[PDB]
Structure 1
Amino acid sequence: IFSDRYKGQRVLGKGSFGEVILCKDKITGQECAVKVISKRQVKQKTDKESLLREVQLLKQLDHPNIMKLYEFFEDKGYFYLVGEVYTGGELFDEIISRKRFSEVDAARIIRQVLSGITYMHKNKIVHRDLKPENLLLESKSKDANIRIIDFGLSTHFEASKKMKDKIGTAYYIAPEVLHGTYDEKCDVWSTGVILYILLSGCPPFNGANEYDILKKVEKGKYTFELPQWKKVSESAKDLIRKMLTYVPSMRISARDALDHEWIQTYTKEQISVDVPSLDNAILNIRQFQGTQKLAQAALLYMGSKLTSQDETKELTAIFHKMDKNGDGQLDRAELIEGYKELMRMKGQDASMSAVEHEVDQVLDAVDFDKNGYIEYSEFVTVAMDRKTLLSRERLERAFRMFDSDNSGKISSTELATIFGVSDVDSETWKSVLSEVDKNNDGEVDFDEFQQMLLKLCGN
C-alpha cells in the first residue's frame, strides 16, 4: 500500500493522466515524484496482465534521457506510479530565457531526445504523445540533461477529450496516429516536429484551432518557406525531411537519425562550425510558448473557478450541519473537521492534509487575536477565494509572459489565436467581449481578459 511507504510533501502539478505529487519515503527520506491515475476518470486500454508486465519491464530499464520509474501501487480507486523527480522544469521554459540559440544547441537537445527514444524502441516501448511538455530538465540550465516523461502510458490508458487535457497536442501527433495504424515511427515524427520548432520557432503544421492543425498534419505538407530557414543548414533540413516523411516505413528510424550527419557534426563537444544565433526563431518560440501557456492558464483558471463554486456550496452545507446553535460561529477545531470533510466529499481532490495550516492562515486574516469563534461564512470565502490564488497568479504570470513588449494589452488577433487554441468559439468570445466592454477597440487588458474568462465559465 502506497501510504505505508510514501508521504506526500507538495504538489508538483497536473500531468497527462493525473496529478503529480512530490513524495518522500517514510524510512529513507528519499524524495520521489508520484503520478496518481484515477481508475474512474481514466479508462484502461489493455488487460492488467499487460499493464503489470510493462511496468515490470520499465523498472528494469535505465537511460539518462528517460525518466526512471521505481515502483507501482494500486488501490480500488487509483494507480500510483512512483519515479525520479526532476526539478529543472520544461525544456521550452528554459529555452525562452536564452539570449543566444544556435543549430549546435538545437542539435544537442535533439540528440538527447533521439538517444532516449532509440533505447525505448529497442525495448518495444512507444511514446505516441511526445511533445515539449514531456521534455523535463534535471536543472534549469542549457547544460542540464533532458529526461523524457510518459513513455508507455498511452499504450495502456486512453486520453480524455477534455480540452484542458488535450490543449497543444495537435502540433506533434503523427498522421498515422490520427488514422489508427501506428508503431514506434510515430515518435520520430513528433521529434521532427520539435526539431522544426527549435530551428524556426514555428510549428510546421500550424493553425488557429485543433481542427485546422490536424487537417494540416493529415495532409502532411510543410515547407521551409519562412525567412528564418535561410539561417539554417541544408543538413538540418535534410534530417527534418527524413523524420517528417509521411509513410512510416519510409521514415527514418530513431537509431539512424542518431547517425545523421547533422547530429554527428553539430553535437561535437568542440564547436567547429558556424554558430550564428537563430534570433528570429527565439522570438517566435517565445511567442509560441507564451501563447500555449496562456491558453493552458486560461482553461485551468476557468476550471478552478467552477471547482470553487462547487466547494463553496459544499463547505457551507457542512458547516451549517455542524452549526447546531445556529449562530453561524464555529471554533478552530470545528473548522478543521469541516474542511477535512469537504476534501473527502469531493473524491477528486489532491493527495493532500493541507487544511489545518490553511485554516490557521485563514484565521490569521479573519480574526488575528483569536478571541474565540469565527463567522464560518467569512472563513469559507477566505478559504476558497484565496485558495484560487495558484490559478489566478498563474493566469496573470502567463498574461505578463505573453505580453513581451509590456503593452499591458492583448490584441483581437492574439485573442483569436489564444481562444482558438483553447476551443472557445469565435462568435462566443466576441459576444462576451462585447458584454464586458462595448467600446473595446480590438484589445483587452488583463482585468478585461479575466472578466471574459469568468463569463465563459457561467460566471
Structure 2
Amino acid sequence: LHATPGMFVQHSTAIFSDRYKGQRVLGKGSFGEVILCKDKITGQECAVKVISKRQVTDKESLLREVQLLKQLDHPNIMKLYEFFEDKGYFYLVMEVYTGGELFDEIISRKRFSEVDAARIIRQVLSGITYMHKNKIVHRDLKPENLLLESKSKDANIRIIDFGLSTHFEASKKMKDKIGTAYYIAPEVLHGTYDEKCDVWSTGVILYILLSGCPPFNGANEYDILKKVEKGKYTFEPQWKKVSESAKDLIRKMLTYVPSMRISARDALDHEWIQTYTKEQISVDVPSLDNAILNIRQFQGTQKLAQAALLYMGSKLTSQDETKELTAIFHKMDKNGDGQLDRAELIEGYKELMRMKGQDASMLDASAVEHEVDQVLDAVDFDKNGYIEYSEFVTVAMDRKTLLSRERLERAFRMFDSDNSGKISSTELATIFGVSDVDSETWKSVLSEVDKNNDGEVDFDEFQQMLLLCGNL
C-alpha cells in the first residue's frame, strides 16, 4: 500500500461544480479556457483548464498527460490537484502560478544577466533531472512552458504542459518527431532519440536567456529546422561579456552527438550552475528543530491516517502556508535535485546538532544513521527510497496547523466516496488503488479509531483519529 499524491487526483466521485466555484479568467490563451476557481470547502484558489469534449486518441493523450502528472512531485514541476470528467467536459484543476510565462520576461528585456539565468536554468535542470530519473521525458521545453509562481522577483519556475511528454526506456528508443522548432533536438528530427533531447532544449533556452536570441533562427519553421538539423551555432556581440563557464555549459548541452551530450544530472552539477551564488537559505534553529521533531514522531501512523495526512499535505496546502518548510527542504537538498535522500537527511541531522551546539561525539558512531533509517522508512509514503517534497511537507508541518476544520472536512469527503457518512475498508482499498485491504490493515485502523464498534469510520471518529477526541 504505497501512498502518493497522484492517487488522489481522479479519486473524487463528486461533480466539478460541487467542489469549485469559478471567479475570473486566467492567462493569455483562448478566452475562458483557463479559469481561477475557489475550492468551495477550503477557499483554496486554483487554475482550472476546461476542455470541451468537442475539442478532444485525443482523450487517450489527455489521460496519458494526467497519468504522467500523477507520477511527478517536485518543487519545479506543475502540481495537478484533480481531474474531473462529465458528459460535456474535462476539468484539469491545477496549482495556480501568477507570474506569467518566462517567454514574457524574455520579450520584455534585452537579455538576462548570468546570475538571473543560472537561477532559472538551475530550476529547469532540477525538474528534468528528477523527471529523467523517473523515466519521463518532457519533449516540449521552451519559455512558454515555464511559468513563474508569482510576480515576486524571486518567484520560482514551474515546468508546465506535459501534452508531449512520455515514459522512456533504456532498451527502446523514441521515434516521434515532436517539439517546437527553435528548441527541438536534431536527433528528434532524424527520428531516433532518448531523454537527452530535453537537455538540448534547455541549452537552447539558456542561449536565449543570455543573448536574447535563438541559436538556430530563420524566416520560418522550415528554415529554422534546416539550421537545427545541421546543428551549427556560434557565439557571434553580447557574447564578449559572457563568462567562459556559461559558454562551456551551453557547448555541452548543445553537443550535437547525443551520446556525447551532457546529462541533466551532470548539467545540474556543472560549475556554472553550482557556483553562481554562495548565498545560504536562512533557516533558524527553532524551525529546523520543529521539522525534525515532527518527522521523527511520525513512525507508527496507521494506513487511513497516513493517506488522509498525505492528501491534506499534498493537495490542500498552498505555497504561502508552507514557506518555512519549503526553505528547509531546499536547504537540506544538497544536490538540488528536489528529492531528499538518506545521505541528505543524515547531513540535516548533523546540521541541526551543530546549530544547537550539541556535542555529536556524545552519541554512538552510527546513532544518526540508525535514526535516519527509521525516520526514512516511516516518512517515505511510497517507499521509493526518497523523501519527495509533498511527503516532507506533510510530515514536517505543525500537525494542529495542517488539521484545519476545512481540511478535515475535505479529506473526509474525499475518502467517503459513496457519501454514506462512514469510511469503509473498501473505500480505503480504492483510494490506495487496490482491490481489497487485508484484514490486519483494517483491524489496526479499527482498534485505534472505531469507538462505536461498527466496523467503519465516521466523521467524528476520523477527526478524533487525527486530532484527544478533537472535533472542529
**TM-score normalized by structure 1?**
0.51
Mark the runs of 5 or more structure 2 residues left unpaired by the alignment: 1-14
Correspondence list, 1:31-430, <5 A: 31-42=45-56, 52=63, 55-56=66-67, 58-59=69-70, 61-94=72-105, 101-151=112-162, 153-155=164-166, 169-225=180-236, 227-269=237-279
C-alpha separation in 1, matches of 2:442 and 2:219: 14
State the 1:291 CA deviation: 56
Q: Residue 464 of structure 2 contacts residue 470 of structure 2 at CA under 8 Å; is this kept in 1?
A: no
For the 8 Å contact 1:362–1:383, the answer to whether it is kept is no
Alignment partners' CA distance in 2, 1:389 and 1:244: 45
Quick check: 70-79 or 28-37, which moved more?
A: 70-79
1:458 equivalent to 2:464? Answer no
Describe the shift of the 1:334–1:98 C-alpha distance in structure 2 as closer, same or farther (beyond 3 A).
closer
- Structure 1: gaps spanning 5 or more residues: none
CA distance in 2, matches of 1:126, 1:116: 11
Deviations 1:172-216 (A, max 9, x none): 122233333333221111110010011111110011111111111
Distance 1:158 1:408, change over 3 A: farther
Deviates more, 1:7-16 or 1:191-200: 7-16
Change (3 A) 1:112 1:415: same
For residues 398-454 of structure 1, the C-alpha deviation after alignment (integer angstroms, 9 at most, x for no partner) is 999999999999999999999999999999999999999999999999999999999
Offset, 1:217: 1.1
Structure 1 stretch displaced more, 205-214 or 97-106: 97-106
Maintained 8 Å contact 2:299/2:378: no
Contact 1:63 1:116 in 2 (8 A): yes
How far does residue 337 in structure 1 lie from its aligned partner after superposition?
65
Change (3 A) 1:304 1:414: closer
Q: Distance in 2 between matches of 1:124 and 1:63?
A: 14
Distance 1:61 1:96, change over 3 A: same
Residue 360 of structure 1: CA displacement?
65
Do the aligned residues in 2 keep the contact of 1:138 with 1:145 (CA within 8 Å)? yes
Alpha-carbon distance, 1:67 to partner: 0.9
- Give the superposition deviation at 1:396: 47
The one-character-per-residue Cα deviations of 1:237-287 (angstroms, maximum 9, x if unpaired) are 111111112232321111110011111122432799999999999999999
TM norm structure 2: 0.50
- Checking the alignment, whether the CA contact within 8 Å between 1:331 and 1:374 is kept in structure 2 is yes
Contact kept, 8 Å, 1:90 with 1:136, in 2: the verdict is: yes
Most deviating of 241-250 and 57-66:
57-66
Cα pair 2:22 2:38 within 8 Å, conserved: yes
Q: Is the 8 A contact 1:297 1:391 kept in 2?
A: no
After superposition, what is the alpha-carbon deviation per residue over 1:363-397, rounded to whole angstroms, capped at 9, x for unaligned? Answer: 99999999999999999999999999999999999
| 168-177 or 140-149: bigger deviation | 168-177
- For 2:263 and 2:328, the matched residues in 1 are separated by 58
SS at match of 2:260: coil
The alpha-carbon deviation at position 41 of structure 1 amounts to: 3.0
RMSD: 25.7
1:162 Cα offset (Å): 29
Do 2:302 and 2:444's aligned partners in 1 also have CA atoms closer than 8 Å?
no
Cα deviation for residue 82 of structure 1 reads 1.2
Greater displacement, 109-118 / 364-373: 364-373
Q: Given that residues 102 and 276 in structure 1 are in contact (C-alpha distance below 8 angstroms), is that contact kept between their aligned partners in structure 2?
A: no
Q: After superposition, give the CA deviation of every residue in 1:269-328 in whole Å (9 maximum; x if it has no partner).
A: 279999999999999999999999999999999999999999999999999999999999
1:34–1:272 Cα change, 3 Å: closer
Q: Equivalent residue of 2:34, what SS?
A: strand
| Aligned-partner Cα distance in 1 for 2:284–2:332 | 72
- Kindly state the Cα deviation for residue 68 of structure 1 after the two structures are TM-superposed: 0.8
Contact (CA 8 Å) 1:290, 1:402: kept in 2 or not? no
